[PDB]
Ligand binder design. Sequence first.
Ligand SMILES: N[C@@H](Cc1c[nH]c2ccccc12)C(=O)O
Length: 394
Amino acid sequence: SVWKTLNKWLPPLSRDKDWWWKTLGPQINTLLTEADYDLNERYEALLLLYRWVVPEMGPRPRSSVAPSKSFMTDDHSPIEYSWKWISGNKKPEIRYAVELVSPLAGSKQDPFNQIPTRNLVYNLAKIIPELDLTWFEHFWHELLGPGSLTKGSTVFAALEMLHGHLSVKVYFIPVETPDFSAWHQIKHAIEASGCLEALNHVDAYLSSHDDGRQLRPFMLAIDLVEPAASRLKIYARSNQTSFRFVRDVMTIGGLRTDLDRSIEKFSDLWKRALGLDPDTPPEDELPKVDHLTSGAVFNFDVAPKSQIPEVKAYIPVRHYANNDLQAALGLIGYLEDHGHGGYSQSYLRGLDMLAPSGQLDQATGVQTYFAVACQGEDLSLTSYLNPQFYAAFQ
Ligand SMILES: N[C@@H](Cc1c[nH]c2ccccc12)C(=O)O
């Protein structure tokens, strides 16, 4: 085991950092091993984890009560893994998002817990040269800086191990005021970035469409590459849960055509993963669940390369499915029905590793979202996983 070797030989850490190491290391190593990553990449992932992530995770979990209301996960776990399924018998891609913390979180020196994420990004930039911080600095400055109701967090980072190299993504969650909505801030920032037809399409949809007006933008994500190559993803939530609504948002009210076959496949997967009745009418709503993160969630890639924006829909399994085992088996049934299930048992072993002792069959929580994108006639799927350090304190 790569983690066992590194733990045998790296210098021992203090109580909190060591707990985080002996918890996150085995988890990330297990996921990468089930995704068949090369040994060297496993070593790199865990050495990054040991030097830059573990020291900045804060105090170790000690109760079912989290020391923050972090927006990363519903139980406020500050880590979220994700397992992207790749077509054509290829290996899955492993990514993990982290919200680092410091004893200054909440003080007037860092009231929204932003400095550790900044430092992490700068450290990575110093080590990996391919990272570009021009747009990070722009959007940080416009959304979190000295000018700038809270979702519990305002920034976090994501490491994508792309089999060969590492990419970084940054998420800004604007703080809203009665006069400046999150969407207001994100639109003004993007318009200042120096790109804009796709943004205008999203603005028209959100402002004047009957189903677009039910979306509330809340997050912006960028990649730390050259700004011409970076994606601009705007995340939007709605109280609506009918698949008729999800389909219309996927089509942006019809701006996107040539999506009929993939949306049929999407309806199949939606009912399969959520455990719905196969004859469920697309007009029907999911049974109501009141929660800060309930409802349908979507992202709109509004990057200048695109002309028309692209949409990714997130099936919220933690809120509308019956249990993680049912949801995972439904997703895997869809994937294997389309020849994309070479790593189904690897995914299940990862789930069992992440799952609270004996709860895959009884509860939701491990899988947070199944993200769906319509690539031509097929689907692109991503499973988002929550380690549940507090909902399931071991
Ligand atoms: N946890 C928050 C933010 C978030 C993290 N990862 C996400 C992926 C998709 C949508 C939202 C998120 C939410 O569910 O909204």
